[PDB]
Amino acid sequence: RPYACPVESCDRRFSQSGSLTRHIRIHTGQKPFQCRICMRNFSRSDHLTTHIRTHTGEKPFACDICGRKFARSDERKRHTKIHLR
DNA sequence: AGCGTGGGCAC
DNA sequence: TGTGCCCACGC
Ligand SMILES: [Zn+2]
Ligand SMILES: [Zn+2]
Ligand SMILES: [Zn+2]
User: Fold this and answer.
1) Site described as Interaction with DNA, positions?
2) Exposure string over A47-71, b if 16+ CB within 10 A, otherwise e
3) A30: which of A19, A42, A45, A73 lies 20 to 30 Å off by Cα?
């Protein structure tokens, strides 16, 4: 509720100053972080990190039940539930 | 499946 | 003033 977004259409607010200014990038279209492999620009450093794994094939997250690996923790999370029948 | 991408947040 | 996870959607 403290920090807020000045643009007309939006009615959003952020507790941390950083999240307000991160959101503002949606409006300005700023994409600060670039992939030195395919040159594609991204809005967030964390999304650039996971994107790079699509190129390298790095998959740090293994399923506890079957061991299948994933580049992202949420992909693994989405996967694990399939072992429930 | 593969994976873009914003919000909540701890640090 | 960032960095970097977890979470959630969406397609
Ligand atoms: Zn806004
Ligand atoms: Zn790339
Ligand atoms: Zn599995």
Assistant:
1) 1, 12, 16, 22, 40, 44, 68, 72, 78
2) ebebbbeeeeeeeeeebeeeeeebb
3) A73
| Domain ranges within chain A, ordered by starting residue | 1-30, 31-57, 58-84
Say how far apart CA A85 and CA A78 lie, in whole Å. 14
**Residue at shortest CA–C1' distance from B10:** A16
- Nearest protein residue by Cα to C1' of nucleotide C4: A46
Experimentally, the structure was elucidated by X-ray
Name residue A43's beta-bridge partners.
none
Buried b (16+ CB within 10 A) or exposed e, A11-38: eeebeeeeebeebbeeeeeeeeeeeeee
Fold designation for A1-30? Double Stranded RNA Binding Domain (3.30.160)
**Taking the domain A58-84, which CATH number applies?**
3.30.160.60
